[PDB]
């Protein structure tokens, strides 16, 4: 019975872990969107026909 | 007859021993419950995702 009761701390630690990865995944989605926009910007600036102001 | 009357002291001493063991058993049950809670706390403190306040 002592073991069966002590399992509750294990379940709480596992839930805390899932919460941690959830926050990390939110930040990762935002980072991926910014990374795609950055790639688009560098790709647009690769053009040599651009005038200096647009660059 | 003197022996048969003397046996009463034996019966009284044996009941005293039963009462002593009973008090010890009550204290032991309280100790076992406290030990189970202490194992839960050490187990939950084993986690390293905890911030220092929860620790």
Automatic annotation (TrEMBL), chains A, B:
Family according to the record: Belongs to the bacterial flagellin family.
Entry function: Flagellin is the subunit protein which polymerizes to form the filaments of bacterial flagella.
The protein's assembly and partners: In C.crescentus, the flagellar filament is composed of multiple flagellins of 29 kDa; 27 kDa and 25 kDa.
Bilayer-spanning residue ranges: none
Official protein name in the record: Flagellin
Phylogenetic placement of the source organism: Bacteria, Pseudomonadati, Pseudomonadota, Alphaproteobacteria, Caulobacterales
Subcellular location: Secreted; Bacterial flagellum
Portion held of the full protein: 56 to 110 of 273
